[model samples]
Target chain A: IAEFKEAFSLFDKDGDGTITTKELGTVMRSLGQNPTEAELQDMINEVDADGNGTIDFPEFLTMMARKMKDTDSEEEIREAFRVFDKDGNGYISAAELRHVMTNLGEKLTDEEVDEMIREADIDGDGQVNYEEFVQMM
Target chain B: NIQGRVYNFLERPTGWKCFVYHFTVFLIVLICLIFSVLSTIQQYNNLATETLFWMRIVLVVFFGAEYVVRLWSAGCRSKYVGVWGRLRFARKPISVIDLIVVVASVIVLCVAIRGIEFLQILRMLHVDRQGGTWRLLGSVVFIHRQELITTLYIGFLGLIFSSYFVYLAEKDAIDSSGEYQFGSYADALWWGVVTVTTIGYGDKVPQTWIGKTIASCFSVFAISFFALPAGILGSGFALKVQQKQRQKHFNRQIPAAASLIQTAWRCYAAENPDSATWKIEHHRAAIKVIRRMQYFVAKKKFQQARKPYDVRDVIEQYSQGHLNLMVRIKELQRRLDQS
Candidate 1:
C-alpha cells in the first residue's frame, strides 16, 4: 500500500489523492514515458471507473497492476519490425521494406519507397531502424 | 396415406413435431434399457413373469414395424429408390446400426439370451446426433486427427527409446537381492511405461549414474511429449469454437476506425484556416495522404479476413487511428496552451 501510495502520489502531482489528466501527463513526461495529452486523457477516462473524470488511488493501482503484466509490448513490436527487416540486420533497409510491402499486396514505386523511408527515418540515415520503425507503427 | 411426409418425419424431423417424435423414440429406447438392466438383478426375478415377456414381445414387434416402415418409406428419397438403391441406403452407418438393433433383438427373443439389451444404447447415439454439442466435438476431433496421430507416434517413439535405453543402462546394475533392478527387458519396459506416462511408481528405477542420467533426460522429454497431443487438441477445439463465433459476430466498430480519422482531419482543417491558393495546394497533399492511408487500411482489412486478420487486425487498425488522434489532440492542446 505504501509503495502504491508513493507511485500514485508521484502521478498525483498536486497530492490531492487523485490523478487528473494534466498531472498524469506531467508525471509521465517527468519519468520520460512521454504519453500524449490525449493519451493521458483517455487513460484517466478508461481507468477512472467511476463517473469522475479523475483517477482515484484505487484506479491508479489497477492501472499499475494491468500495465505491469503487459510491459512486453516493446518486444512484440520489435518482433513485428523484424518481420520486414528480413535480413536479420536490425534495420529495415529501403529494398527490404519495398519487397515486403509488395508481398503484402502493395506495389510501391521507388519514389514511394523513398518517401516512406524518409518519413520514418528520424536520423535521415536512409533506413528505418528499430526506434524509427517502432515510432512509425 | 402420405409417403413424402412420413419420409421427412423419419429421416429429417424439424420443429416441435421433430421434438415430439424424437422424445417418444427416446422414451421407448430408455424403457428398453431399464428392462435390460432389471433382467440382470437377482431380486427382480419375480418381476420377470409372462407379462414381462409380453412387454419384450411388444418392444420387438414395434422395432420390427419401425424397420419395415422405414424401408417402405425409404422409396420417398431419391437416393433410396429401387432395389439396389435401398440396399445402398441400408448400408449407411445409421441404417446399419438400426438394422443391427432390430436383428440382435430378434435373435435375443428367439434364443432367450437376456443380457444383450446394451444394443439399445445405439439408438441413444441416434438421438444425440441431432444435437450440436456432440457434432461440434466430432468436428474438433476430426479436424486435428492428423496432428493427434503425429503426436501419438512421437510419444510412442519416446516410450520405445526410453524403455530400450533404461534396459541397456540398468541390465548389469543389481538390486539388493543380487538381481538386476531391470532384471528383464520386460521389467525395464514396465518402468518406461510408468515413467513416460508420468505415473512414476518408483518401484523399478535406475540404480547406476548412467541409468539415472538417462532417466532424468527421458523424464524431461516425456513431460513435454505427453503435453503435445493435449496441446494440439486443446488448440483445435478453441479454434473451432472461435470460428463458429466469428460467423455470428460482426465488427460494428470497423467503419468507426476510419471514420474517426476523417473526423480528426476535418477538425484540424477547421481549426487552422488557410488562403484559397494555399488551401488548394494542401488539399492535393491531404487527398493523396488520406486516400493512400485509407486504401492501405481497407486493403489490409480485405486480406485479413482471408487468413489471420480478425480481432487482431481490428485492434491494430483501431489503435493506429487512436494514436494518430492522440497526437493531433496533443498538438491542438499545445496550440491552446500557447494562447
Candidate 2:
C-alpha cells in the first residue's frame, strides 16, 4: 500500500508526487471500506523503505514495474495475465478471462475457468490479481 | 473591412493553400537546418552544395514571409487581441521555436555566423505527426497533446539553456590552446544534446571544470524530463482504456451469476419429494457466486478510476443497466449471506 499510495498521488493531483496515507484511507472509505488508522499506517509502512514518509519517483516506478507483465517465471501464467489484461489495468476481469480463453486458441467455459482461478487467487479476493497469479504458477 | 477578412483568411491558415504554406516552409526550413549543421565541418562541404545554397535562400525568404504573416495574423490567431496581442503571440514558446528554426538557419547561411544550429533541430520535433500515429494511440495522444507539447517545450528549453551554458563555460578552456575548439557554439550544442540525454558521447568532450559541473546537473534533471510527460500520458491512456471497456459492456461476474442463477431457478421450479433440499443446495451455491459477483464489480469500479474513489464515481462508471445489476447484486448478496 506504500507503493499504491505513491501511485495514487501520481494521477491524483494536477501538480505533484507525494502522499499521506489518509489520501489512501479516504479512497478506501469512499469505496465502502472503513479501514482503521492502524491498518492505513501499516499499508504505508510496508514498502516505505528508508522510511522517508515520502515515496520517490524511482521507488514508485519500481513498485509498478513489479506488477507489470512478467515473463521471467511460469511463462504460461505470465502470458495469461498479459494477454487477458490487454489494456494493462493490473487485473483481468472475469469477462476478460472468458474472452481471453477463446482468443488463446482454447475453448474453456466460464464454469471450467472457475476452477481454473481457484488455485491462482492468492490475495483472497476470489479473483485473479497479479500477486496471486505468481503463487498459482 | 473586407480586406481585413481576406487577410485573416490568407494569413491565419484557414484554407488548404495557407496550411500548405506553413507545412512547405517547415520542410524547407528543415532542409536548411540539416545543411547548416553539415557545412560546419570543412570536410563535409560536399554535402552542403551550391544547389543547397540556393535552396537555403528559398527557405529564408519563405520563413521570413511566414514569420511576418504569422505576426500579421496574430489577431486572427488570438481572435480577440488588441495591439499588444501580436507581441504576446510572438513571444510564446511555439512561436519562439519557429523564430529560432528560421533565424538560425538564415544566420548560418547568410553571414556564415554560427550558434547552436543543432539546438534549432530540436524545434523540428514541434511538428506533430499528422498521420497514422494517432490511429492506434490516437485518443491518448490527442487528449494529452497539449501536455505533450508542453513537455517537449520544456525539453527544448533544457537544450537551449544547457547549450548556452556549455558554450559560455567551455568556449575558451583551450587545454591545448585552440588546438581543438570545444569553443564552437556548434560544439557546445553537440555537448548539450549529449549531456541532457545523458548519453555522454565521448566524441565532443567538454574540456573545462565548469563544463563538467553542468553535465552533472543535466544528468540529474534529464531523467525526469520524460517523467512528467509520461505521467500525463499514462493517466490519459488509462482513461481511454476504461471508456473502451465500458463501451464493450465487459463483465466478468455475469457468466458466473447467470450460471448459478439458472441452477437455482431450475432446482426450485421442480416438484419432487427431494425438491426442497435440492433447491436449497443450489440456492446456497448461487448465493456464494452472487457474493463473489459483488466484490468482482466493486473491484472493477476501483481499478478504472485514477483518483480518490467515490461510490458515486463507481456508480457512474457502470452503464445504464449494469449499475442496476450491481445494486441488485449488493442487495441480493446481503439478503442471502444473512440467511
Candidate 3:
C-alpha cells in the first residue's frame, strides 16, 4: 500500500487527482534519469486506456491499483516519497507542489520553503494533514 | 519611423538568424578594437606614429558618432531633462562606458593626443576597453553557470597535467640561449600554464622548434574554451523548448476531463434530484469518467483523451435511465474517504 501510495503520489504532480506525463518526466528527471521520446510514448500507450493522452482520477486510480499490486519494494516506495516531498516537509503541501518534479538534491531555499508552507496551509490551519498531502502528491 | 525601424531591427531578435547577426557585429567590434590597440602600441614603440595619429582621429570620430546614434535611438531625451532621469541613465553600465569613451576622445582631440604621453595613454586605455563584450560574456557565463563551472574544473585539471608534462620535457634544455630555452623546469611550467589558459604571456618567447610548435597547437586548442558557453547555452535552450512543448500538451488535456465531469454531474442532477438511485448513478458515472481520464493521462495520450465532446457524450449516456432509486455505490465510499 505504501509503495502504491508513493508511486501514485509521485505521478500526480498537481494533487488534482490525475496523472500527466509531464509529472512522470519531472519525477524521472529529478531522479537523474530522462525519459526518451520512445519511452515517454510507450508509457502513454500502456496507461491510457481510452487512448486519450491523459489520465483522469479513475484511470489514475486503476493504474495505481495495478502498479501497487505488482510492486512490493519498500525502497521504491521511499524513493517515490522522496521525489514527491520536494520541500522535505515530511508531508506534501499543495502550494509547494509543481507539475514538474523539482530536481533531486535541489531542496527549496529557506525563504521559498517557508513561503510554500504559508501558502499551502489552505485552511489557514498553519499545518497540512494526510488528506492535503495525498492530494498534492 | 526610420529610427523606430532601426531600433526594432537591432533590438527585436526573433530567431537563430538574428542571433548570428548580433554575434557577427560583436566580432567585428572586437576585431576593430584589436586593430586599434595594435596601432596605438606600434605608435608608442616608434614604429608608426603618423599612421597611428590619423587612425586614432578616425576611431575617435567613429566612436563619437556611434555614441550619438545610440543616444538618439534610446528615446531618452525627455528623461535626460530631469535630474533623476539623468542619474538613472548615467547609472546604466553601457551608458557610463559610452560617456567615458566620448570624454576620453574629446580630451585626446584637445591635447595633441600623442600615443606616448600619460594622459593620452589613459585615454587610449579608456577607448580600448571592451565593457560591452565583457558584460555579454558575464551574462553568458551566468546563464550557463553549471556548464561553465564544469568546463573550468576540467580546464584546471588539464592545465595541471599539461604543465607537468612541459616541466618534464624542457628540464634538460635550460641554457640553450635560443627562444625555446626555458630558464628552468619552473619557467617551462609557467609557460605551460599560460599556454593552456590561452594567455600567452609572451615574455618567455619559445625559442626551440619543438617548443614553438607545441605553443601553436596549444593556442589553437585553448580557444575552444570560448565556445564552451555557447555549447552549454544551446543545450539548455533545447531542453527549455522541449519542456515548454510538454507543458502545453498537458494543459490541453485539463479542460476535457473537467467538461466530462461537468456533463455527468448535470445529467445525474437533472434526473434524480434526491433519490438514492440518482446518487448511485451520479457516483458511478463520475468514477467511470475519472478512471477513463486517468488512463489517458497516465498513458500520455492527452490528445486522444482530449477529443472534442466524446468524453461528454459517454458520461451523459452512462448516467441516463437510473433516475430515482436510492443506492450509495462502493466507489462513492472510496471517494468519500479520499475527500
TM-score per candidate, chains pooled: 0.44, 0.28, 0.31
Docking class of 3: incorrect
Sorted into a CAPRI-style docking class, model 1 comes out as incorrect
Q: What DockQ does model 2 achieve? A: 0.02
lDDT of 2 by residue, B174-205 (tens): 65545666757888787777766667767777
Off by over 4 Å in 1: A1-137, B15-17, B20-37, B44-46, B112-115, B129-146, B169-182, B199-213, B245-339
Off by over 4 Å in 2: A1-137, B1-27, B33-50, B77-79, B110-115, B128-236, B244-339
- Candidates ranked by lDDT: 1, 2, 3
DockQ of each: 0.01, 0.02, 0.03
lDDT of each: 0.61, 0.55, 0.51
TM-score of chain A of 3: 0.39
- Give the per-residue lDDT of model 3 (tens digit) for B125-184: 443233555765565557777778878777667666666655555655644444445646
Note the B-chain TM-score for every model.
0.58, 0.35, 0.38
Q: Which portions of model 3 miss their true places by more than 4 Å?
A: A1-137, B1-81, B112-140, B165-170, B173-180, B194-234, B237-339
In candidate 1, which residue pairs clash? Answer: none
